[PDB]
Amino acid sequence: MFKNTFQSGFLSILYSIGSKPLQIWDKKVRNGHIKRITDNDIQSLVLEIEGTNVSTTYITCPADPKKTLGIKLPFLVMIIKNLKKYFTFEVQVLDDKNVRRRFRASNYQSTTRVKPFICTMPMRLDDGWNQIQFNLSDFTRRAYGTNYIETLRVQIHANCRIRRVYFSDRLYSEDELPAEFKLY
Amino acid sequence: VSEGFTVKAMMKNSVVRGPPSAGAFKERPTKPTAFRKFYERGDFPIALEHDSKGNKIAWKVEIEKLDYHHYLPLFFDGLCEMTFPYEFFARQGIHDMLEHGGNKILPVIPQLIIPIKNALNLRNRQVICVTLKVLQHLVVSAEMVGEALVPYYRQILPILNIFKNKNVNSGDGIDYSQQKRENIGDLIQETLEAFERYGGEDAFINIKYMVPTYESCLL
Amino acid sequence: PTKPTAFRKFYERGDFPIALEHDSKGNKIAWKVEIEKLDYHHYLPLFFDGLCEMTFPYEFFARQ
Amino acid sequence: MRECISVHVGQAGVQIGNACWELYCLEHGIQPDGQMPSDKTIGGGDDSFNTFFSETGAGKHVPRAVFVDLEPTVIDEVRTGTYRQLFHPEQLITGKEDAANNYARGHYTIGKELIDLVLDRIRKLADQCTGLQGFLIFHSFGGGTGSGFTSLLMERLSVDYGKKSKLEFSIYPAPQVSTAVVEPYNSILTTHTTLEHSDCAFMVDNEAIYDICRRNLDIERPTYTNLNRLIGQIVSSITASLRFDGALNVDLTEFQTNLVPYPRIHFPLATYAPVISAEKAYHEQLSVAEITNACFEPANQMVKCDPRHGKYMACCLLYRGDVVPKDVNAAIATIKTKRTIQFVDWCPTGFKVGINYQPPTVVPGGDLAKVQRAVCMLSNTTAIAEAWARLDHKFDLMYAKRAFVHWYVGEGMEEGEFSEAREDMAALEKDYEEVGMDSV
Amino acid sequence: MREIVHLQAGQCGNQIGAKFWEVISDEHGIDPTGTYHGDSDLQLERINVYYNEATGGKYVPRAVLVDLEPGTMDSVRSGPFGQIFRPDNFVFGQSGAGNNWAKGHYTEGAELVDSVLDVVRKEAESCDCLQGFQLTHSLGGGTGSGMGTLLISKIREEYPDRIMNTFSVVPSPKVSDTVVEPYNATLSVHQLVENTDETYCIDNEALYDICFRTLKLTTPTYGDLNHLVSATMSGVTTCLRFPGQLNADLRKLAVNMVPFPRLHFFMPGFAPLTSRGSQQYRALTVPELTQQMFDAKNMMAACDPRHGRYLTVAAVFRGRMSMKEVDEQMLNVQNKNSSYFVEWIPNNVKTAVCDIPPRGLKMSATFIGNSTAIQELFKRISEQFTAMFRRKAFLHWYTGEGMDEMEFTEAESNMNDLVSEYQQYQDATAEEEGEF
Amino acid sequence: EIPKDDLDFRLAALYNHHTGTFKNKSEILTHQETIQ
Numbered sequence A: 001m002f003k004n005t006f007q008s009g010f011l012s013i014l015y016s017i018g019s020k021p022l023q024i025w026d027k028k029v030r031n032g033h034i035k036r037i038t039d040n041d042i043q044s045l046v047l048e049i050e051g052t053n054v055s056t057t058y059i060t061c062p063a064d065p066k067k068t069l070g071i072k073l074p075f076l077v078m079i080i081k082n083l084k085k086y087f088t089f090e091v092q093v094l095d096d097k098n099v100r101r102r103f104r105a106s107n108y109q110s111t112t113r114v115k116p117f118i119c120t121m122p123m124r125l126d127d128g129w130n131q132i133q134f135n136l137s138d139f140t141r142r143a144y145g146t147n148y149i150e151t152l153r154v155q156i157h158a159n160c161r162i163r164r165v166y167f168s169d170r171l172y173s174e175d176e177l178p179a180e181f182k183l184y
Numbered sequence B: 001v002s003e004g005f006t007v008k009a010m011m012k013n014s015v016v017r018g019p020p021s022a023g024a025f026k027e028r029p030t031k032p033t034a035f036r037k038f039y040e041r042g043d044f045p046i047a048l049e050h051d052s053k054g055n056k057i058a059w060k061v062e063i064e065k066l067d068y069h070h071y072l073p074l075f076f077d078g079l080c081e082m083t084f085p086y087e088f089f090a091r092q093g094i095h096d097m098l099e100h101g102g103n104k105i106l107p108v109i110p111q112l113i114i115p116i117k118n119a120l121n122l123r124n125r126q127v128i129c130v131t132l133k134v135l136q137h138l139v140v141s142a143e144m145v146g147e148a149l150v151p152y153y154r155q156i157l158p159i160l161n162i163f164k165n166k167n168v169n170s171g172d173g174i175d176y177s178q179q180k181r182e183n184i185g186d187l188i189q190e191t192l193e194a195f196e197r198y199g200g201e202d203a204f205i206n207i208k209y210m211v212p213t214y215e216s217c218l219l
Numbered sequence C: 001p002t003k004p005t006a007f008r009k010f011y012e013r014g015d016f017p018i019a020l021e022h023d024s025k026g027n028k029i030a031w032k033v034e035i036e037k038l039d040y041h042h043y044l045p046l047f048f049d050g051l052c053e054m055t056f057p058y059e060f061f062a063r064q
Numbered sequence D: 001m002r003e004c005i006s007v008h009v010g011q012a013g014v015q016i017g018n019a020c021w022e023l024y025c026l027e028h029g030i031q032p033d034g035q036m037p038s039d040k041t042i043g044g045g046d047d048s049f050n051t052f053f054s055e056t057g058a059g060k061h062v063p064r065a066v067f068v069d070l071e072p073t074v075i076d077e078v079r080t081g082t083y084r085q086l087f088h089p090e091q092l093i094t095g096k097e098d099a100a101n102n103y104a105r106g107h108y109t110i111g112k113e114l115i116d117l118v119l120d121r122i123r124k125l126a127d128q129c130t131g132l133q134g135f136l137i138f139h140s141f142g143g144g145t146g147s148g149f150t151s152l153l154m155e156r157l158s159v160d161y162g163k164k165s166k167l168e169f170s171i172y173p174a175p176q177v178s179t180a181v182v183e184p185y186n187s188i189l190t191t192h193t194t195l196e197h198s199d200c201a202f203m204v205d206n207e208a209i210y211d212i213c214r215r216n217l218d219i220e221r222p223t224y225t226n227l228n229r230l231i232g233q234i235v236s237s238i239t240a241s242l243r244f245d246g247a248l249n250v251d252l253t254e255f256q257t258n259l260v261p262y263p264r265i266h267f268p269l270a271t272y273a274p275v276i277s278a279e280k281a282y283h284e285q286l287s288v289a290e291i292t293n294a295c296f297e298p299a300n301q302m303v304k305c306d307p308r309h310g311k312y313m314a315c316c317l318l319y320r321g322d323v324v325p326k327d328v329n330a331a332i333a334t335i336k337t338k339r340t341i342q343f344v345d346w347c348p349t350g351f352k353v354g355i356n357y358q359p360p361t362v363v364p365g366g367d368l369a370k371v372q373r374a375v376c377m378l379s380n381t382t383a384i385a386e387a388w389a390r391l392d393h394k395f396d397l398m399y400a401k402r403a404f405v406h407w408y409v410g411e412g413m414e415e416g417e418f419s420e421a422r423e424d425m426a427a428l429e430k431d432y433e434e435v436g437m438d439s440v
Numbered sequence E: 001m002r003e004i005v006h007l008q009a010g011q012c013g014n015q016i017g018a019k020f021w022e023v024i025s026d027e028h029g030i031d032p033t034g035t036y037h038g039d040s041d042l043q044l045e046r047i048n049v050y051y052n053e054a055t056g057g058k059y060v061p062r063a064v065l066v067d068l069e070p071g072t073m074d075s076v077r078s079g080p081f082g083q084i085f086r087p088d089n090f091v092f093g094q095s096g097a098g099n100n101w102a103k104g105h106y107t108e109g110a111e112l113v114d115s116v117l118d119v120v121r122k123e124a125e126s127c128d129c130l131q132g133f134q135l136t137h138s139l140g141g142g143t144g145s146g147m148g149t150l151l152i153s154k155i156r157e158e159y160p161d162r163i164m165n166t167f168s169v170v171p172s173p174k175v176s177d178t179v180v181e182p183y184n185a186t187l188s189v190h191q192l193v194e195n196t197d198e199t200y201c202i203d204n205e206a207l208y209d210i211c212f213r214t215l216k217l218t219t220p221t222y223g224d225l226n227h228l229v230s231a232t233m234s235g236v237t238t239c240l241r242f243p244g245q246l247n248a249d250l251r252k253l254a255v256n257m258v259p260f261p262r263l264h265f266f267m268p269g270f271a272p273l274t275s276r277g278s279q280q281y282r283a284l285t286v287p288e289l290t291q292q293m294f295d296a297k298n299m300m301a302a303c304d305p306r307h308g309r310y311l312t313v314a315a316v317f318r319g320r321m322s323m324k325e326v327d328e329q330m331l332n333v334q335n336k337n338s339s340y341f342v343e344w345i346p347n348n349v350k351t352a353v354c355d356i357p358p359r360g361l362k363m364s365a366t367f368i369g370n371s372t373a374i375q376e377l378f379k380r381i382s383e384q385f386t387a388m389f390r391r392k393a394f395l396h397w398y399t400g401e402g403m404d405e406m407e408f409t410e411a412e413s414n415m416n417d418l419v420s421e422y423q424q425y426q427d428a429t430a431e432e433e434g435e436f
Numbered sequence F: 001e002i003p004k005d006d007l008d009f010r011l012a013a014l015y016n017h018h019t020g021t022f023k024n025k026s027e028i029l030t031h032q033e034t035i036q
């Protein structure tokens, strides 16, 4: 549950150079496929999910549907490729009044709706190997009058290339980052 | 035991027999080509360099000022061959004919669709490796081949259509065939974005017409 | 009868800069930040939730 | 002064209307021509009709309807069928060519050649109002203007009228029987636009109404007449608290506060318990307890959705006739004693009860009987989670090879508006899981 | 308010639309001279889909009739209902094509088509909202087929947002009058894939087989076969002309059957076809429309559907019927035979009902079922055509008329295009990489 | 086991309302006690 984990300055729940990377995540593939090689500039292998549909092929983070990872750190930073096709990624939260709320950022939405459990926002990938540093504890403060406690799931659907999925207790400049976490 | 839309197979117990089969995804019988018939006769100025690094085509004339109006529709004519020597001058010759020279590849591509499509109609899984490697190399090593091939997706794309989604479904299992390009539904993808990247405007329509799951990247 | 509070589930997580000076005089909580510039909006309702503690180490941090 | 305009969109929405507007002219004394007879009264006056009808000087009653359509030969059945002179000509407004079973044709291509005219008649029907409760809409989720122009009908009404109780009745397309091949593309694109813009929404399958006409009324081979007769009785009982006063009263506002727990959960599912034919109606005494039993019963529900696979969130009952409030509460408390009928643990109260006094009227040529008392149920169960987990796959059976997508993408939209549409059913399906799981 | 203009092509086109107009005129109650001697109001509600009014109370069709022989189409006036047509609409050449599509494309058809288009614009700007046009022809000859290609290919270019129905008689495998059949048959279809998006492919030997094994005629003629085809031509587009419980126009079926923009070659049928001795003895229920209409005997094209996979199915019904029984028969057949029907379409059948039946019949139904056994017609056309074209049999009456020889070679691979497409969508799988 | 006829129809009648199609009356109420 990552409960007795110390949960220090960083924490990471996937990496690409691994004997078994998708060990905790539950893979579900339908009209799709998964492999382990894609490498534009960095000579390092990378996970793959793509299929024609953006909703059936996904890898959910808790293999148990019931079990939850409780993670307190205010950011969520992934190193994920651009493809000029679709992508959705989802991470739901828990706020101060003990409610389970959502945050979805996908390529193709026009404007953000705000609703009780659901809030869907746009997202725009850069041309190269983008890495995204996501703001958790301000988006739960603008969309709702809450404060942050923990985020409980991550589930990523079709058409991207995955290496180094992690979380951050704050923001770093790229020169401050340790060398194994850097873009290059 | 049942057959179809009859008084049988309306019963409360039956086992129905559907359609027999379909001629898709299955390998086709081959035919005698014309590169065979012109290599034995002996017009080709090609020999076989036997280097330490491998095998290369020896040339006894200019490669640049060849009569490509005779020859370029005569090595795609022999691309459909699987026996060892005959596929080698076909594959290795086409690369060296194309990277040399220029300003003559434009009027010869009208006459190449018959032994591009007949290379691809065979449903064999090593030519579809080889013939879909040169379709990336065809578009690159020239100038303004893009705007001459834009009414020419109606004839060559139906065989990329059936096989565009050929990939590997292995979870954390590292593969080792990424060295060579065996995996075809990979190679069908980056060839189609190579058609849209060149070709100028108005060619983003003309793959969406034909491989219907397409998504026109590169705005 | 009592029920567990928010203080217990926030000390195990570990946001607080509380640490215990086991003195020979007695027990005093070390402070690894200035007590003035702490966020009292974020803290003062939370130590008051540890006021309902009876077992040892958490009720001391509430009272002291 | 309690008043509501009616909108009947689509060729299937006209069929619903004339079974539901013959129903109102029998409930009052209004004839085919709109004037009550000089002799031969039907009841005591008091402007009970005034929620639906409106009055000139000379003694005529013209409904507050507008029959909007794109198919010009189904309303010409109404322009010469017996209720010819009940309407103005200007309320029945037909286009030139249909959406042709394309929501994207009805939304973008054709629908704004008839959207200025609708919102000019709508203001004239609703500025002579004073105390307008809301509107009603009647459609079906198979066809083009049932799916498409109704979205432009209400997104325009969201900003023109602000917050009025714009009610929605519907037909949800069945699991197995299906008249169309383009059917699931429409329903995942129109549920997306009847989330934000409808205040409540009523689902009813055509397949389930086939089951109870075959089994309860025991007419083999029903027709679309005997499916719109039943829908009128349900609409009759919702507004019966507004026309004829009773022991308890429940207006339209006191449903919305009382049924739906969250702003995305407004899908009740109805039934009407004494659907009994006259060869076997008058034999059995029909108490208010044993019609409360048959509302809950899973065979008789009106959507292929039974609450044995989920848990109820709130219920809402509408009794009519010879019904006394002490005997309603005797049967409400019986349901709460059984472990098979699962109520959720944020509603320990559970029920909402209205009693009216007027028995439901009976149509000539129709197929039910004249019964003293009846009941209508509007529950809200968790088991609606199977009404999109089937529609998603049946939509995704087609969309992962892009079947039929060129008939909407070319007709005025883009490819991403399908993949913003399956996401909301991948959000709605988890909400019905979320508000169903028990708090520990 | 949704008009349509009928344009008929060639000798067989004028033979088909001379009995189709008897069919329409008798079902709208009007006499040989033109007047309305009819007893209803549903016969003059929507008569403006086809007809048109003159001064003094006469109705004329919006029919324009094209021919390349002068004495052919003025034998059509001499029929029973042949004087109802306005004589300006008749357009005819002088020297015929000679049963050659090249003479009907380049040389002798290109000077008639200007006058044909003049009459077409005159009949097509007259309307209220023009839904579309109709074509009727066979793919054996040249006056019908060559002109029928040229006029659709230059009529879609100026009326493109309209609907454009095609009736095509494709040539038969084992009965074959014209020796030069396969040249016309493989040179017309690449025009009819690009130019119409709506084509009903009917065949003469399948029209013979019904009249031998089902109607059991001792002596069928081309009038009886034309009577077969027009009783499908009417029943497809009743719903424009008559009210319905659940109705469906031609725009409703054209969006519905065709999954991708090439797949539009359909196979008709008709439900209560019955011999004269067995007519009175046999009931007419909706099961006895469905079993007879889906039956592979009583089909109207040469493709047997048991040798492939149904892509989509139609059914248009005429009578007073019940929607439960109509909507349960399709479900019964589709889940009781479920290896034919395509996997990634979960309910494959479209249905409409109309209230007003054909004359003397209590009930009827009509089939339009897009199947993937249409690959076989294209394969046998390709085989006979390339067999003749390998040693260049009759090339010079098409090649001395201004042609290149590689137009044939591209017009065979524009046919091998559709063969492999129909082989793809037939063997495609619900979950991919199940078969590689 | 049954008190009433709200519960006799709602015992293990083994009819999924979402999955049974075009059924008669007698094939709805089919408890497990008739099958074995």
Ligand SMILES: Nc1nc2c(ncn2[C@@H]2O[C@H](COP(=O)(O)OP(=O)(O)OP(=O)(O)O)[C@@H](O)[C@H]2O)c(=O)[nH]1
Residues within 6 Å of the ligand: D009, D010, D011, D012, D013, D015, D016, D070, D071, D098, D099, D100, D101, D102, D139, D140, D141, D142, D143, D144, D145, D146, D147, D171, D173, D179, D206, D224, D227, D228, E245, E246
């Ligand atoms: N309950 C009920 N459903 C009907 C009726 N008539 C048609 N339907 C349903 O309507 C759907 C078909 O789409 P339609 O509503 O007819 O489309 P439309 O609103 O008429 O507009 P168009 O698509 O242009 O014809 C199917 O689900 C039918 O089952 C009816 O009389 N009663």
Ligand SMILES: Nc1nc2c(ncn2[C@@H]2O[C@H](COP(=O)(O)OP(=O)(O)O)[C@@H](O)[C@H]2O)c(=O)[nH]1
Residues within 6 Å of the ligand: E009, E010, E011, E012, E013, E015, E016, E099, E138, E140, E141, E142, E143, E144, E145, E169, E177, E178, E203, E204, E207, E222, E223, E225, E226
């Ligand atoms: N299906 C059908 N074919 C007909 C009929 N009458 C004539 N034909 C066909 O007419 C063809 C010969 O005439 P055709 O080639 O059409 O003359 P053209 O149009 O001027 O070239 C033969 O193949 C016959 O099959 C008919 O009533 N039905």
Ligand SMILES: [Mg+2]
Residues within 6 Å of the ligand: D010, D011, D012, D143, D144
């Ligand atoms: Mg409709």
